[PDB]
Amino acid sequence: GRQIHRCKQRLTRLTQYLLKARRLALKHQPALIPIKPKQAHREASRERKALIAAKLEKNIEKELVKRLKSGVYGDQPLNVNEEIWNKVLAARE
Amino acid sequence: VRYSASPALETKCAKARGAYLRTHFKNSREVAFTINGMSLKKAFIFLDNVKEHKQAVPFRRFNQARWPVKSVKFFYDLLKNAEANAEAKGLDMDKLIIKHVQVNAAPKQSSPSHIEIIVAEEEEAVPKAN
Amino acid sequence: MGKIKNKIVRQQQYMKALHQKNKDKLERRKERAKEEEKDPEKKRLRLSENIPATIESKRVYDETIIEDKPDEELQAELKDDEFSAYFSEERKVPKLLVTTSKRASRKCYDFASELLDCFPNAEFRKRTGDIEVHEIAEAAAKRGYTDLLVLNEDRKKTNALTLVHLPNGPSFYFTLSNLQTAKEISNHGRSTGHIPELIINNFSTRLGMTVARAFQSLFIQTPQIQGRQVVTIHCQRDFLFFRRHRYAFREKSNMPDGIGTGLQELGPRFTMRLRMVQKGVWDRKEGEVFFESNAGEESDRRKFWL
Amino acid sequence: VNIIKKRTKPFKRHQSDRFKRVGESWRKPRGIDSCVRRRFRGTISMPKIGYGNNKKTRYCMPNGLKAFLVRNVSDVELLLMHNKTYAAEIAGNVSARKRVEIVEKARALGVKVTNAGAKVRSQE
Amino acid sequence: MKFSRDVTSSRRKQRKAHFGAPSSVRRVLMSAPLSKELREQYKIRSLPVRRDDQITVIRGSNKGREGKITSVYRKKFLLLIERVTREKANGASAPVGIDASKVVITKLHLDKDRKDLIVRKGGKV
RNA sequence: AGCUAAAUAUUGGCGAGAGACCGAUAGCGAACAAGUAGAGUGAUCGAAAGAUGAAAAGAACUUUGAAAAGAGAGUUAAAUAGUACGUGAAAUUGCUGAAAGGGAAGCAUUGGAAAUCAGUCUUACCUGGGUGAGAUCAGUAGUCUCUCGAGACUAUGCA
RNA sequence: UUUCAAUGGCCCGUCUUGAAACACGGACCAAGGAGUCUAGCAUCUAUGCGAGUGUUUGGGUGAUGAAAACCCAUCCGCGAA
RNA sequence: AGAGCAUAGCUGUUGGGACCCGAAAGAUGGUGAACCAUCUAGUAGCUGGUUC
RNA sequence: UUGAGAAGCUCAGACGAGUAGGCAGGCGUGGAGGUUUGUGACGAAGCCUUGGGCGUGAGCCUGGGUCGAACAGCCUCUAGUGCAGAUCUUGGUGGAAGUAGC
RNA sequence: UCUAGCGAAACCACAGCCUGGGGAACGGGCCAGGCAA
RNA sequence: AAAACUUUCAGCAACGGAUCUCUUGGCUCUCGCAUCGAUGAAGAACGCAGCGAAAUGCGAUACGUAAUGUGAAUUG
């Protein structure tokens, strides 16, 4: 009875495996894309250099003022003030 | 070379480094300590005062006042190197401040001392739009 | 050099050779200075020739980069695309919905709020249940949305942003990096509800134009100048940088125009790397690949795609 | 039978805080006049067999499972019939490739994985 | 398995032999395969490298790109291939080296000594 | 008075094969310029010292500096490999942030506070029907390996 | 984890001394660093054989390391008296 | 109406450089009373140390 | 009733200071024969870290960061195998100290 | 004497207000005390 | 009570060169063999390279010649 007892348990425990394998397949479970230590490092270093070669504050500076120079706004925007708009008028003419 | 400050990328800053400089480490630390946070032009004037004995560097950790000139001379080139590196970037000169300075021990071969300096800007933009 | 195996010898051989290399480099620099100060034209021609190289200049040649002259074929293709409703006379107002991964944490809920801060008129619904992304996009199509943003978070750290264009627009999948909240930014500011002003720079390549085009579709077409809030998307070596700022102009002597604005970072601040562009709603398996980056090819640092 | 421990804090070596050449690994103080070895007040404790935990609870994680170290995907299969008492610990050097094979197999098997989110990343 | 006591099986002694070998012993250490159609034409497997031998690189960053052997650099076990170069800092070309057992010989430089070597090893032209 | 092979010895010399041997404070005094530098009138004594990388691709060029060097910039898979070069521990020192700081500190218990991690899960089970299915089921037909029937299948119908 | 609050706790090792007192040794960190190798004797236990017992001086042999393994001639040692 | 013999281990003991470190040596032979090299692992009841 | 690693499982009671010393079971290091049809460029070994665990404990397993070419669990074999001291050997480094001073 | 410049060795368990008592010194740590900035 | 100074903890940079991996080296055992010099040995010194720092090599025929081979490289 011990030997037949252990086989029935395994049949019970194997069926629950097969059931769980079925339900997991049905659900659209997420993939598990791994992480590489070489690509993570190389992209970490290449990025830091880009920030240095991006010049964010300078690039947003010069192109925004040229946007103001071209005047994408109306007659006079609410962000600008008259003190500096006078130099805007002198420079643009 | 990777520095010791989270700033000093191309944002608003320029660097400068000194390696194995033939000056006493203790003097450089005290010189660095007093000039930290001052305006760049203000620091230049103060260093001149030290040469002319108009002002003396306090000695707090390594102890009161003194007038070292060799360590100040080493710092003069580094600060001059600092602003020369600022110009290459093309920053706004009149608002330079000494945001960071650090003196580190060197190999025991006379006690030399690495020196680094970081110049930066101070800015505030009003939100308004209330 | 490396021929001699003794350690202390090869150091003395190098240091002697290093000093000699610096000495003759000195004299050639000095004589060049002596002759250049004598003839300023020699300095002029050297400067006009000896331009230091850079990755952008040494970039490998690819034909997809568009010329400065706007080509009619491109505009013909792009005047009837998915986003054309936002660019035509229709002037569609885009509403955004931000979701997370299944059973995420509160880290995103304090970063997606910063995202929502930079995106006025953009709802948010925390993902609940067994609903998949291809089912959210269908639901948002009839609800009245335009684009859908998902902030995947795992190990209590957000790492991937995928966004799809409703109803059947292309889907993009970026991997965020250096995502710093507004608190972790020095001299941060508090932002209001004013509509930010988009700025998109350095998107020369054709594929980059499309990715820039979708991001433009993500914003309200009518900026609020009075709030003067600026959102920056800048691509440099494929690393798209998203930043926010408040700009107030000042009188700057360095800038030859005479005016230059001070900037104050508002948050957030993060990177993206375009991992894959899909056609149709984002499906990990059964989608159509507009572009999927080979990781071995990116090692050619002078070659780009955005 | 719940997971209850007779003590949380570790046993540190005596005077291990003062010195750095002295390691924090517990070493029995054999000093002849050592009052700390002599169990005075204000001193530290000392490992005794009286500190052992319940024999039906020894090696049990706070959630009741006993950690079981699985090297490869063969090892995760034999925990088919002890999933209610053992938890598949993934070895530290198992690569991210086989690490997913171990977690996906263990998820369907019904067993609990303790470090299922290491070196990997989900994608929806 | 080795059975002769005339041969050795020592990492220390075999490496000593490899890097202590002079050029007339290094010329056999630097051999190259032959192209499959040419391998069966002469019925020989591999031949030592030689200047002015047309070869194709099979492994490395320079895989596939063909050429000849400008000069064989015996003292470091390298093959210098024309047009297989590298852009230095100063814009010049520092030609990278390929080991002799990676490339494949496509067109040999037919010397009188090579012909005898072919027919010596039970071969023919 | 005389010689005489082989069996035997062998920390040297000419080579050779191995090792449950040491793995750069070890093993030789010497993995390298090793009895070498250097010390001593002299006889003698006598060290320290291995590792960039696949490739030198060893940093052009611009700029500051009298230079030395620095900053841009470049190469590289990576410069958290820049020749003071593999990994880079502890002691030790400098900068920053934090809290604490009436002649010590120190640790132990008990908490509190700040700061931070532990782990979260209704979902499955059972039952009811319909709908299409499949087979280990056919009041069914064949092949294969075993030992009638036990497997793996190929048709065919889905009761 | 840092810190605080209340309660507490005379520097460790050696040596000395009933005990201390002591006198010593200790600026800090890393690495190195001390019952080992062998012949003889006796004891206990384990194994093989048992009025026996023990191949390895040596010889035979070993084609795939052959300095291993495997095999036994003439003595001999210790027992038996 | 013999119970040993042989191998391996453990602990013990006696030698051997004999757990590690530390006492002026002495002798032989050299170098220019001095100094050097070896015999030498010369000698200890003693001293200090002897590791999860 | 499944509870035969009979070296297992189970039941009951009392007991618990410790030097010299006696006995027993274990943890750890280098290498050796067997083994895990073991791990490893999708990252070995190592290293740091207020990440999480395990053991009375020696010790162990794991997350993150660096890192870049090897390594380990189990059964036995084996030894130059475990440190806080020895005015210990070697290297490094401080206070003293910018002091004695030159 | 000051200012520059060049710059040790010794020593180092760790410290450092005493008052008394604390039996074996106890004061350099223990308890009662004051002090303690 | 903040700063300064003093203290602990964390980040970062120096300092140092342990750890880990190896390794044209050491040590150990076995094995084979017999070979210096008045025909100038061992040793020493001075020389010698298209340029060598040591280092090897070589002797005014100098980092060697003749001869036998191999057959196209030396390589800073």
Ramachandran class of A71: left when φ > 0, alpha when ψ lies in -120 to 50, beta otherwise: left
CA dist C306 and B35 (Å) reads 45
- Measuring CA to CA, which residue among C192, C189, C210 is closest to residue C305? C210
> Domain range for residue E118?
1-125
Q: What are phi and psi of C30, to 5 degrees?
A: -65, -50
Using DSSP's 3-state secondary structure scheme, residue C139 falls into helix
Min Cα separation C154/chain D (Å): 7
Q: Cβ–Cβ of C155/D124 closer than 8 Å? A: no
CA distance C53 to C106: 46
Nearest Cα to D37, choosing from D14, D67, D54? Answer: D14
Structure tokens, C159: 């790492």
Nucleotide nearest to B26 (CA to C1'): I98
Verify cis geometry, omega within 30 degrees of 0, for the bond prior to C94: no
**What is the spatial distance between Cα C200 and Cα C261, in angstroms, rounded to a whole number?**
18
SS3 D12: coil
- Cβ-defined contact of B11 to A52 (cutoff 8 Å): no
Amino acid E10 CA to nucleotide G68 C1' distance, rounded Å: 21
- Residues C275 and C269: their CA atoms lie apart, in Å, by 19
Ranges of each domain in chain D:
1-124
How many C-beta atoms lie closer than 10 Å to residue E47's C-beta?
20
- Cα of C160 to nearest chain D Cα, Å: 8
Q: How far apart are the first and last CA of chain E?
A: 35
Task: Go through chain D and tell me how many residues it has.
Answer: 124
- DSSP state, C266? E
- Spell out the residues 6+ positions from residue B127 whose beta carbon is closer than 8 angstroms to its own: C189, C190, C192, C246
With contact defined as beta carbons under 8 Å apart, do B15 and B117 qualify? yes
| CA quadruple D12, D15, D21, D22: dihedral sign | negative
- Which chains does chain B touch, 3 or more C-beta pairs < 8 A? A, C
What is the rounded CA–CA span in Å between residue D107 and residue D87? 12
The sign one gets for the Cα dihedral A59, A62, A66, A68 is positive
Q: Check if the beta carbon of residue C246 is closer than 8 Å to that of residue C228.
A: yes
Contact D100 A34 (CB under 8 A): yes
**What are the residues whose beta carbons fall under 8 Å from the beta carbon of C66, sequence distance 6 or more?**
C74, C204, C205, C206, C209
Whether C236 maps to a domain, the answer reads yes
Q: Which residues in C lie closer than 8 A to residue D122 (C-beta atoms)?
A: 101, 152, 154
Q: Which residues of B touch C247 (CB under 8 A)?
A: 125
Q: What are phi and psi of C196, to 5 degrees?
A: -75, 160
Q: How far apart are CA C24 and CA C15, in angstroms?
A: 14
Other Cβ atoms closer than 10 A to E78: 17
- Going A51 to A52 to A56 to A57, the CA torsion angle's sign is positive
* Resolution in units of Å: 3.1
Give Cα separations from B95 to C258, D82, E116 (angstroms). Answer: 16, 70, 83
Identify nearest nucleotide to residue D30 by CA to C1′ distance: G13
The whole-number Å distance from B66's CA to I51's C1' is: 49
Hey, are the CB atoms on C162 and D124 less than 8 Å from each other?
Answer: yes
Q: Is C200 left (phi over 0), alpha (psi -120 to 50) or beta?
A: beta
CA dist., res. A61 & res. C216, Å (int):
20
Cβ count within 10 A of residue E112: 7
**How many distinct structural domains can be found in chain C?**
1
Task: Choose, out of A33, A43, A75, the residue to mutate when testing the contact with C (most C CBs < 10 Å).
Answer: A43
Q: How far is it, in rounded angstroms, from Cα B55 to Cα B46? A: 7
Q: Are D94 and D65 in contact (CB under 8 A)?
A: no
**Is residue E57 a contact partner of residue E63, using CB atoms and an 8 Å limit?**
yes
Distance from B124 to chain C by nearest Cα, in Å?
A: 7
Nearest residue on chain A to D82, alpha-carbon basis: A13
E strands, D39-108, where?
Answer: 66-70, 86-90
Buried b (16+ CB within 10 A) or exposed e, A25-48: eeebebebeeeeeeeeeebeebbe
Cis peptide leading into D29, omega within 30 of 0? no
User: A13: nearest CA in chain D?
Assistant: D81
Sheet containing strand C239-251, strands side by side: C177-180, C259-272, C239-251, C229-236, C197-201
Which B-chain residues 61-100 have CB contacts (< 8 A) with chain C?
90-94
**Structure determination method:** cryo-EM
Within 10 angstroms of residue C298's Cβ, the number of other Cβ atoms is 18
Distance from CA of A38 to the nearest CA of C (A): 11
Separation between the CA of D38 and the C1’ of I9 (whole angstroms): 41
Do residues C154 and D118 lie in contact, with contact meaning Cβ atoms separated by under 8 Å? no
Tokens of C10: 């090869």
In DSSP notation, C232-265 reads EEEEETTEEEEEEEEEEEEE-SSSTTSEEEEEEE
- Measured over the CA atoms of residue E100, residue E105, residue E108 and residue E111, the dihedral's sign is positive
Pick from B91, B125, B128: which is nearest to C263 by CB? B125
C-beta atoms of D122 and C284 within 8 A: no
CA of A50 vs chain B CAs: smallest distance (Å): 10
Instruction: Give 3-state DSSP helix, strand, coil % of chain B, rounded to 5.
Output: 35, 25, 40
Query: For C225, which of A60, A73, A87 is closest by C-beta distance?
Result: A73
List CB contacts (< 8 A) between A51 and chain C: 236, 239, 241
Neighbouring chains of A at 3+ CB pairs under 8 Å are B, C, D
Sequence-distant (6+) residues with CB within 8 A of D123 are A30, A31, A32, A33, C152, C160, C284
Chain D hits for C162, CB-CB cut-off 8 Å, are 124
User: DSSP letters along D46-60, please?
Assistant: ---GGGPPPTTTTTB
D34 touches strand G (CB under 7 A): yes
Chains C and B touch (3+ CB pairs under 8 A): yes
Alpha carbon A51 to chain centroid distance? 16
DSSP per-residue string spanning B69-125 = SHHHHHHHHHHHHHHHHHHHHT--GGG-EEEEEEEEE-------EEEEEEEE-----
> Tokens 């100060």 identify what position?
C37
Residues 64-103 of B, Cβ under 7 A from nucleic strand J: 65-71
For residue E81, CA distances in Å to C77, C180, C212 come to: 47, 50, 44
The strand ranges marked E within chain C are: 96-100, 122-124, 147-154, 157-165, 171-175, 177-180, 197-201, 229-236, 239-251, 259-272, 274-279, 288-292
Taking CB atoms and an 8 Å limit, are A79 and C232 in contact across chains?
no
Task: Give SS3 for B17.
Answer: strand
Q: CB–CB of A53 and C301 under 8 A?
A: no
